[PDB]
Amino acid sequence: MVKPPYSYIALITMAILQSPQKKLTLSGICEFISNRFPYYREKFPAWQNSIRHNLSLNDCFVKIPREPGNPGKGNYWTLDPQSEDMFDNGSFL
């Protein structure tokens, strides 16, 4: 059921947009996936990390492993000023 599309790079493109600024919370991402990937996560919940691998291997942002300021909910992934190609390769389609 759900017959979802098999696209990783795309899975991230949507996982990145999640942040209208420049902060992605892997915790808010995993929950964001199941939001539209129930039969996928409910079937392949072990791929939760698999996506993370391509997640940072896609854009190449910086994750904060237990930052000395937050309480302990998620992370603050920020896109590095190197690619900025996905940010707006075309312009704003």
Curated annotation (Swiss-Prot):
Domain of life assignment: Eukaryota
Keywords annotated in UniProt: Activator, Developmental protein, DNA-binding, Nucleus, Repressor, Transcription, Transcription regulation
Compartments, as annotated in UniProt: Nucleus
SMART domains: FH
This protein's GO CC annotations: chromatin; nucleus
Biological process (GO), any one: positive regulation of transcription by RNA polymerase II
Signal peptide: none
InterPro entries attached to this UniProt entry: FH_FOXD3, Fork_head_dom, FOX_domain-containing, TF_fork_head_CS_1, TF_fork_head_CS_2, WH-like_DNA-bd_sf, WH_DNA-bd_sf
Main location (coarse class): nucleus
Pfam families named among the record's database cross-references: Forkhead
DNA-binding region: 3-93
GO molecular function, one term: DNA-binding transcription repressor activity, RNA polymerase II-specific
Subunit text: Interacts with POU5F1.
Function of the molecule: Binds to the consensus sequence 5'-A[AT]T[AG]TTTGTTT-3' and acts as a transcriptional repressor. Also acts as a transcriptional activator. Negatively regulates transcription of transcriptional repressor Rhit/Zfp13. Promotes development of neural crest cells from neural tube progenitors. Restricts neural progenitor cells to the neural crest lineage while suppressing interneuron differentiation. Required for maintenance of pluripotent cells in the pre-implantation and peri-implantation stages of embryogenesis.
Protein's recorded name: Forkhead box protein D3
Organism of provenance: Rattus norvegicus
Gene name of the record: Foxd3
